[PDB]
C-alpha cells in the first residue's frame with residue numbers, strides 16, 4: 001500500500017488528452033509521436049523544437065513523512081534522416097510543472113536550455129537523460145567528441161556520458177530508474193539485436209528539483225536535422241520511506 | 243499497454259492531482275472529509291462535496307480497437323449522533339467537466355439535479371452508492387432499508403443489496419468493471435468480515451463519453467453525518483475483449 005502514480009502508452013492516439021504538446025510536437029496518422037517538425041512529405045527540417053509532458057504532476061517527496069519518490073520509466077524511439085551528420089537528439093526529462101521551451105534551444109540545447117544559461121546549474125531545474133547524435137566541437141563544445149547517452153543535471157554538459165551508436169531507423173528500447181535509497185539514476189538502453197548500453201549517476205533529486213514535477217520528452221534539430229519518433233512510453237512513480 | 247493507475251494511502255493537504263468540489267476538504271489527519279464539518283469536527287446540514295482525479299480515463303480507443311477495463315479500491319467510515327444519519331457516499335464516473343448539480347445536497351448524493359434526477363435521458367453517470375437514508379417523503383426511489391446500489395443515469399438504483407451502516411467503522415470496497423462481460427461488480431467488507439456483494443450488467447461505452455473522470459461524492463440534506471474517505475486506488479487498462 002503506497003502513494004503512487006503510473007501510466008503507459010503503446011501507441012499515441014491523435015487525441016491524447018493527458019498529454020501537453022509543446023513547440024513542433026505532434027502525432028502521425030500511424031500513431032507514432034513525432035517530436036520535431038517535418039515538411040509536406042514527412043522529411044525532417046532545420047530549426048525545430050518539440051516536447052511532451054504528461055499533465056499529471058509527479059510528487060518527488062513529502063518532507064512530512066521523509067518519503068521520496070522512487071521512479072521508473074520505459075520508452076522506445078527511432079531517429080531517421082537523409083543526412084550523414086543527423087542532429088540533434090531526444091531526451092527524457094523532468095522539470096517544474098510549468099516548464100516551457102527556452103529561446104535559442106533548437107539545436108544542441110535539445111529544447112532544454114537557453115544558451116545564456118545552458119552551463120549555469122544555478123539557473124536551471126532539470127534532470128534529463130539524453131541520446132545525443134551531434135557532437136561537433138565547434139558548436140557543441142560541452143560534448144564529448146563522439147555520439148553518446150548522457151545524464152544532465154541542470155546543465156547541457158553531462159555529469160556522466162557513455163559512448164553510443166545512432167542507428168538510422170532502428171528502435172532503441174530504454175529503461176531509466178531512480179532509486180531514492182541509493183540516490184542513483186540508472187540508464188539501460190538496448191537495440192533489437194541486443195546491443196546494449198549502461199550508464200549511472202549519483203545525484204539526490206530532492207536537491208535539484210521542486211516537490212512537484214512533470215515528466216516527458218524533448219527533441220530538437222539545428223542546422224542538421226532528423227526525425228525524433230517516440231513509439232511507446234510508460235512511467236511509474238512511488239513514494240517510499242527514505 | 244495503455245493504462246492509468248494511481249494510489250492514495252491517505253490524503254495530504256496539498257494534492258495537486260485532485261479536483262475538489264463544494265465542501266470537500268482534507269483534514270489534518272490526512273482523511274478526505276467530503277462533507278462540511280464545524281470547528282468541533284461535527285457534521286452539518288445541507289452539505290455536498292466531491293473529488294475527481296484530474297487525469298482523464300479513456301473508456302475505449304478506436305485507432306487500436308481497444309476497450310477499457312477498470313478497478314477501484316477504497317475505504318470510508320461515516321459518523322453521526324442520529325439514528326437516521328444521511329445521506330451517503332458514492333464512487334462515480336462522469337464526463338470530465340462534471341460539476342455539483344443544483345439541489346444535490348441531500349438524497350441526491352451530490353450527483354443529480356432534483357428536476358432531472360430520475361430522467362435517464364438527462365444524465366451521464368455510473369455510481370456505486372452507500373445510501374444510509376431511505377425515507378419515502380423525500381427518497382421515494384429508495385427501497386425501504388439502507389443499501390448499496392449501482393446507479394445508471396438515475397438516482398433510482400438499477401440494482402441494490404441490503405446493507406448495514408456501522409457507526410465509525412471502516413468499510414473496504416472493491417469495484418471492478420469487466421468490459422468483456424459488460425459487468426460492474428462490487429464487494430464491500432467490514433473489519434469483522436461481514437460482506438456485501440452486488441453486480442449489474444452495463445456497457446460503459448453506450449452510457450458514458452469516450453473520456454471520463456472518476457472520484458467520490460457525498461451529501462447531507464436535513465439529516466447529516468460526516469463522510470470520510472481513508473484511502474483510494476484506481477487502475478484502468480485499454481485492452482482487447
Ligand SMILES: OC[C@H]1O[C@H](OC[C@H]2O[C@H](O)[C@@H](O)[C@@H](O[C@H]3O[C@H](CO)[C@@H](O)[C@H](O)[C@@H]3O)[C@@H]2O)[C@@H](O)[C@@H](O)[C@@H]1O
Pocket residue numbers: 087088106107108109134136138139140221222223224225
Ligand atoms: O566555416 C564556418 C564555420 O563552420 C562551422 O560552423 C558552422 C556549423 O557547423 C556544424 O554544422 C554545426 O555545428 C553548426 O551548428 C548548428 O547546427 C548544429 C547541428 O544541428 C547544432 O547542434 C548547433 O546548435 C547549431 O544550430 C554550425 O553552425 C565551424 O567549423 C565553425 O567553426 C566555422 O567558423
Ligand SMILES: [Ca+2]
Pocket residue numbers: 088108132133134135140143
Ligand atoms: Ca550535442
Ligand SMILES: [Ca+2]
Pocket residue numbers: 329330349373374375376381384
Ligand atoms: Ca437515499
Ligand SMILES: [Mn+2]
Pocket residue numbers: 130132143144148150156158
Ligand atoms: Mn551531449
Ligand SMILES: [Mn+2]
Pocket residue numbers: 371373383384385389391397399
Ligand atoms: Mn439509494
